[PDB]
Amino acid sequence: GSSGSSGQAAPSQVVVIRQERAGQTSVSLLWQEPEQPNGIILEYEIKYYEKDKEMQSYSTLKAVTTRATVSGLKPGTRYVFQVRARTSAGCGRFSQAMEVETGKPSGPSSG
Fold it and tell me: HSE (CB half, 13 Å, CA atoms) of 10?
């Protein structure tokens, strides 16, 4: 009905994300600052999981800057990345479902 609480408003939700370099097992990301942070942002948490294989336990990545690189993935496998801003006050929502595919093992990226 009515939950009682006190504090500051939650930060905005980053809706801008770009891929800097997509490695075979590692992938990089690039997003911008949230319209309204509503305070100081400690770090951005990214969520990456097997696009095809949805695992209950998703892996998170702590990033201090607008740049990050997720390592420890499988080649030739799509991964859904999701960057979000976290603030002492609370937590915001996850960015849009970003689809990215790593470099297939068959061979290199270019040829």
Answer: 12
Q: What domains can you pick out in the chain, each with its CATH number?
A: 16-103 (2.60.40.10)
The 3-class secondary structure across 62-111, one letter per residue, is EECCCEEEECCCCCCCEEEECEEEEECCEECCCCCCEEEECCCCCCCCCC
Amino acid at 67: R
Are the C-beta atoms of 45 and 59 separated by less than 8 Å?
no
Deposited experimental method: NMR
Cα separations (Å) of 54 from 29, 37, 51, 79, 95? 21, 30, 6, 10, 17
Tokens of 64: 């201090």
**Cβ-based neighbour number of residue 4 at 10 Å:** 4
Contact 64, 6 (CB under 8 A): no
The torsion angles phi and psi of 54, rounded to 5 degrees, stand at -90, 100
